[PDB]
Amino acid sequence: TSQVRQNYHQDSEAAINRQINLELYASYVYLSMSYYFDRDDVALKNFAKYFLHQSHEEREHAEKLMKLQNQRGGRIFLQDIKKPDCDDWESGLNAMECALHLEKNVNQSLLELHKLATDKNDPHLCDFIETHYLNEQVKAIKELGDHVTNLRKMGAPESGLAEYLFDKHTLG
């Protein structure tokens, strides 16, 4: 047993390892989306920048969970990072919709993690999740919803003008 370990259930330790993988997966999805918008036949530079920033943020989310694992005396176990579901993301609107779906999936995992921490009476872990993750997810989901709404109202994905102007005025 780690000399630092206290009130940290083996199930919580395992769940933190699963969450690390999921954050790394999210980072990879956003990386793929970013460079789709950098293609010469897509060419929306602010969509590209927005998703690259999201990719780097997800890596930070993963790193903070790795730090947490060690803080509590658990042991990090890494798994393959699966490639994203798509190679071609179709449009700005479709990428935003996929990002919304992704962030809601990550949120669901965090809520399950919090339920586990609650069941194991781990208030430090509950506070960690609430402080660093739960409101971040609510904000991310709200922002993506807002973006999807605007793109739809403007006439995307059929209107290339809509996506062009959104790229300039919202993401620029």
What's the CA gap between 73 and 55, in Å, rounded? 28
Contacts of 125 (CB under 8 A, 6+ apart): 8, 12, 72, 117
Is 61 labeled as ligand-binding?
yes
42 binds a copy of itself (CB under 8 A): yes
One-letter amino acid at 141 equals: I
- Residue 29 gets the label, from left (phi > 0), alpha (psi -120 to 50) or beta, of alpha
Phi and psi dihedrals of 20, rounded to 5? Answer: -55, -50
Contacts of 13 (CB under 8 A, 6+ apart): 69, 72, 74, 75
Residues 12-31, interacting with Mg ion (CB under 5 A): 21-22
Is 137 labeled as ligand-binding?
yes
61 binds Fe ion (CB under 5 A): yes
123 binds Cl ion (CB under 5 A): yes
What's the CA gap between 92 and 59, in Å, rounded? 23
Is 101 labeled as ligand-binding?
no
Partner interacting with residue 72 (select from Fe ion, a copy of itself, Mg ion, none; CB below 5-8 Å by kind): a copy of itself
DSSP code of 71? H
14 binds a copy of itself (CB under 8 A): no
127 binds a copy of itself (CB under 8 A): yes
Toward Mg ion, which CB reaches closer, 78 or 161?
78
Closest distance to a copy of itself from the beta carbon of 60 (Å):
11
The CA distances from residue 53 to 16, 73, 81, in Å, are: 24, 31, 19
Which residue among 10, 40, 75, 153 contacts Cl ion (CB under 5 A)?
10
Toward a copy of itself, which CB reaches closer, 11 or 149?
149
What's the CA gap between 101 and 40, in Å, rounded? 26
Closest distance to Cl ion from the beta carbon of 56 (Å):
20
Partner interacting with residue 1 (select from Mg ion, Cl ion, a copy of itself, none; CB below 5-8 Å by kind): none
- Please give the annotated binding residues for Fe cation, written as ranges: 23, 58, 61, 103, 137
Binding site for Mg ion (CB under 5 A): 21-22, 131, 135
